[PDB]
Structure 1
Amino acid sequence: ADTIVAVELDTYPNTDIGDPSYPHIGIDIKSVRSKKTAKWNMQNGKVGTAHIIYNSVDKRLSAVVSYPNADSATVSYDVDLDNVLPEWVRVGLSASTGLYKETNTILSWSFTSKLKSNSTHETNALHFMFNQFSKDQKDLILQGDATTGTDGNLELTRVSSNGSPQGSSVGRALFYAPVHIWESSAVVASFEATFTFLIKSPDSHPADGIAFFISNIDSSIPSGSTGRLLGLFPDAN
């Protein structure tokens, strides 16, 4: 199976598999059952921003999700990613719907990673910024239902001609280049990701969520990972 580290913006409470009983953001370390969560006042139809940060000094993965003029939600978990992920990874965005649905629209996405070597104190870095997605976005790998180009946005899951989101959908976008996320011979390692999103649903409850994730380079959507599995894991273990 793939190795997955993710920050989930989980719009639907699946209490049967350990979700808390409210929309929430979570830190996922090789399991969809978040190691840490925080309650998230998700706002149906509004544009929100997610900010995710990690550095190898504190060894702490944190995320903040917010909407304009509202209190933000924050969640943090102590984790040495050297012991979790492979040295080289891809980074990506994932989303899904199930029996309930929502749009999982990405308006923008940026990422920066840096590695300062122990032997020279010089840095390696990667940065990308997408404020517009085009129809044939060659620096992204799209998987499953994800498409680009509609209003210059990345639609992670399926939306119809008129704008209605569809159920039982799953899709992901990964940045084309592998990222060197840790190195044993590095004095300081760090990364941050930011993305803006629009989750809209005509349903009685929205579902299922969006995740920023870091995985083995050849990661692909596990079969049967629509709904509560967020396109990230093959099961709820």
Structure 2
Amino acid sequence: ADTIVAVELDTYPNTDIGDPSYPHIGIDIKSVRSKKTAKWNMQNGKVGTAHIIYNSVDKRLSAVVSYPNADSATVSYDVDLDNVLPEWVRVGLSASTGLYKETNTILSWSFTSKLKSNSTHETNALHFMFNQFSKDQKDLILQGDATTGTDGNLELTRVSSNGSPQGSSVGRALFYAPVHIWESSAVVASFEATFTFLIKSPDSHPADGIAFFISNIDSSIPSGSTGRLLGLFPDAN
């Protein structure tokens, strides 16, 4: 199986599997059952922003999600990524819908990674910023129903030509190049991620959510991982 570390923007409460009984953001370490969550007052139809940060000194993964003029939800968790992820990984965005749906539109996404090694100003860095997604985005690996082009945005889950979301959908987008997330002889390693999203739900409740994730290089969507599994996990264990 794959190794996943993720920050979920969970819109649908699947209390049977651990979700609190309200929209929330959480930190998932190899399991859809978040190690820690925070209430999130999701706003249907409004553009929002997520900020994820981490550094090997504090060994603390934190995320902040917010909407213009509104309280922001925050969540942090102590975790040493050296003990969880392989040295090389791929970063990406994932979303899904089940019985209930929503649009999982990504307007922009940026990522920065730095590795300071045992030497004088010897830093390795990787940075990419997407504000516009073209039809043939060769530096993105699209999996499942994810597509680009429609208004220059990234649609993680399927959306009909009229613009309405589809249920039972799952999509992901990973940056093409592998990222060196940590190293034995690293003095300091850190990364920062940001993305703006538009979750619009016409029907009853919105579902199922969007997630920023880090995984093994050769990761792919687990079968039947639509709905509650957010296109990240094979089961709800």
Give the TM-score normalised by the residue count of structure 1.
Answer: 0.99
Identity %: 100
The alpha-carbon deviation at position 118 of structure 1 amounts to: 1.9
Deviations 1:42-98 (A, max 9, x none): 000000000000000100000000000001000000000000000000000000000
Match in the other structure for 1:141: 141
- Runs of at least 5 residues in structure 2 that lack an aligned partner in the other structure: none
Contact 1:121–1:187 under 8 Å retained in 2: no
Q: Distance in 2 between matches of 1:165 and 1:126?
A: 34
Q: Distance in 1 between matches of 2:6 and 2:176?
A: 18
Deviations 1:180-236 (A, max 9, x none): 000010000000000000000011110000000000000000000000000000000
**Does the 8 A contact of 1:119 with 1:185 survive in 2?**
no
Distance in structure 1 (CA, Å) of the matches to 2:113 and 2:59: 15
Q: SS of the residue aligned with 2:195?
A: strand
**Following TM superposition, by how much is the alpha carbon of 1:120 offset from its aligned partner in structure 2, in angstroms?**
4.2
Which residue number in structure 2 is paired with residue 67 of structure 1? 67
Q: TM-score, normalised by structure 2?
A: 0.99
Q: What is the Cα deviation at residue 119 of structure 1?
A: 3.9
1:143: how far off?
0.1
Alpha-carbon distance, 1:152 to partner:
0.3
Question: In structure 2, what is the Cα distance between the partners aligned to 1:120 and 1:138?
Answer: 35
CA distance in 1, matches of 2:13, 2:110: 28
Structure 1 Cα separation of the partners of residues 120 and 21 of structure 2: 49
Matched, 1:118 2:118: yes
Deviations 1:84-133 (A, max 9, x none): 00000000000000000000000000000000002444100000000000
Question: Is residue 90–residue 214 contact of structure 1 (8 Å, CA) maintained in 2?
Answer: yes
What is the DSSP-based 3-state SS (H/G/I as helix, E as strand, rest coil) of the residue aligned with 2:16?
A: helix
Provide the rounded CA distance (Å) in 1 between the counterparts of 2:90 and 2:231. Answer: 15
User: Does the residue aligned with 1:37 lie in a helix, a strand or coil?
Assistant: strand
3-state DSSP of counterpart to 2:160: coil
Q: Which consecutive unaligned segments of at least 5 residues does structure 1 have? A: none
3-state secondary structure, aligned to 1:16? helix
- Deviant stretches of 4+, over 3 Å: none
- Do 1:46 and 1:198's aligned partners in 2 also have CA atoms closer than 8 Å? yes
The count of aligned residue pairs is 237
CA distance, structure 2, for counterparts of residue 174 and residue 40 of structure 1: 25
- Tell me if the contact between 1:52 and 1:61 (Cα under 8 Å) persists in the aligned partners: yes
Partners of 2:144 and 2:90 in 1: CA distance: 17
Cα-Cα RMSD:
0.6
